[PDB]
Symmetry: D2
Subunit: 121 residues, 4 copies
C-alpha cells in the first residue's frame, strides 16, 4: 500500500510504490485542495468550469488527479477508484499527476493526499 | 458492497445496504458534483469558503458528503474513507447525506455517486 | 482476525473473537496434530478409518476440526474454508471444536493451530 | 484467484493461474486425501512418521503439499498459508506439487483440492 502527497506543481508526477500487475484490483482515495494558477483551489475532480486548452488528460477536468500505469496514457483518478481493474495489457508503476497543460505547472499550488491499496483478487 | 447515488436535495439521506457491525473495516469512494443553492457546483468535500450556518455536520464543509451509522450523529465522509473503523458504540445501517442546514434542502441540486465495501479484518 | 489453538480435549470448544455477521465472507486455515484417544495423531480432517460412534458432527471424520456459528449445528471446518459464506440465517460467535463423541474428550490429546479472518465483501 | 486439484501422481506438478509478484500477500487452503503408495491416505501435511528418503521438499513430510514460485526451490504449503508473503526476490507462477521422491510418483493416488487468492496489500 502507498500513501503520499501529489503536488500540483510537479509536472513529472509522483511515482508511487504500487506496481500494477495483471489481475490486480486496486482502490484509491484522494483528498485535498490544489490550484492550476488561480487563487481558488479545487478538490481532486478539478474545476468543471475551465475549458481544456491542451490538458495531459482530456478525460478529466483541469486540476483533477490522473494517473499513468507504466507508460500508459493518462487515466482519470479524480476522488478515487473503487476495486478497480485496469484494461488488458496495462501494467507497471502507478504515477499520479495533477492535470494541467504541459509547461504550465510553475504557477500551480497545493497538493492532494492519496492512499492506494491492493484489494483481494 | 454497495453502489448508488445520494441526491443533494434529499434531506432525509440515502439508505445503503451496508450494515456496519463492530470490528468492520470499510472503504468509501465518493464522486460527483452538487450544490447547496448557488449555480456553481462542488465536489464531495463541499465548499471550503462558505460559512457554517447550522449544518447537519459541523465537522465538514457545507456541501460535503456525510453519513450516519444507525442512530449515530453525523460523521464526515468527504471524498471517502480508506480502510476505516467506526468509533466504539456505533452500529447499523449506513445512511449517506448531503451536508446542508435543516429545512434548506429544497434549492439543492446534483448528486454524489458512492461505492462502499467491507475490507479484510 | 483471530489466531489461536483448539485443544482436542476441550469438549465445550474454543470460543474465538470472530462474530460472523450476515454477508460476511471468512477464510479459515487450520494445522497441527491431535487424537481422540489413540497414541497416533491425525490432521484437521481427522481419521478417515474410524467409524462414527456418535460424533458431535456426522458430516466430518472423527478428530476433524468443526465449528458452531452462534446457536448453529456443527459445521465441518477440516483444513479450513476459503472465502466462505455461511448458510442463510446462521450468525454469531464462531466456536471451534474437536470432533469426538460427547463425554469422551478426557483421553484426547494435541491441538490445532487456527487462523480466521474476514475477507472483503 | 485460482481453484483446482493437485494429483499425488503428478510428478511435474499442477501449474496455477497465480503469478506471485513482489509485495503480494496470498492465502492458500488445501484439502483432501492422498497417498505416496500405501493403502492409507494422508491429508495435506502428509505422514509425519515416514522418514525422508530423498523428497523433493526436505522441509515438509512425505505426502505433504508443497509449491514452487517461478523457479524457486520447494516451499511447504501443508494445509495452507494465511496472509503469507514470499521471501525477497521470489516471484513468478505458483506450481503446486505432492511431496514424494523423484521417480516414485507412479504408485501414488488421490489428490488435494486447493484454493489460492491474493489478499489486501
Ligand atoms: O498556468 C496556467 C495553465 O494552468 C492554464 C491551463 C489550464 O488551462 O490555465 C491558466 O489559468 C487560467 C484561468 C482562467 C482563464 C484562463 C486561464 C493557468 O494560469
Ligand atoms: O439554501 C440555502 C442554504 O443552503 C444556505 C446554508 C448553507 O449555508 O446557503 C444558502 O446559500 C448562500 C449562498 C451565498 C451566501 C449565503 C447563502 C442557500 O441558498
Ligand atoms: O475416547 C474414546 C472415543 O473418543 C471414541 C469415539 C470416537 O469414537 O474413540 C475411542 O477410541 C477407539 C480406538 C480404537 C477402537 C475403538 C475406539 C476413544 O477411546
Ligand atoms: O513409491 C514409493 C516412494 O513413494 C517411497 C518414498 C516416500 O519415501 O515410499 C514408498 O513407501 C514406503 C512405505 C513404507 C516404508 C517404506 C516406503 C513408496 O512405495
Ligand atoms: Ca498552471
Ligand atoms: Ca440549500
Ligand atoms: Ca476420546
Ligand atoms: Ca510413491
Amino acid at each position: 500500500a502507498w500513501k503520499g502527497e501529489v503536488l500540483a506543481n510537479n509536472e513529472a508526477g509522483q511515482v508511487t510504490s504500487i506496481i500494477y500487475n495483471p489481475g490486480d484490483v486496486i482502490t484509491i482515495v484522494a483528498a485535498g485542495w490544489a490550484s492550476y494558477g488561480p487563487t481558488q483551489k479545487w478538490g481532486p475532480q478539478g474545476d468543471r468550469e475551465h475549458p481544456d486548452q491542451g490538458l495531459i488528460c482530456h478525460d478529466a477536468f483541469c486540476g483533477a488527479l490522473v494517473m499513468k500505469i507504466g507508460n500508459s496514457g493518462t487515466i482519470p483518478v479524480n476522488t478515487g477508484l473503487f476495486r478497480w481493474v485496469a484494461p488488458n495489457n496495462v501494467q507497471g508503476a502507478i504515477t499520479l499527476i495533477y492535470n494541467d497543460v504541459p509547461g504550465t505547472y510553475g504557477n500551480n499550488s497545493g497538493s492532494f493526499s492519496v492512499n492506494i491499496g491492493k484489494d483481494q483478487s
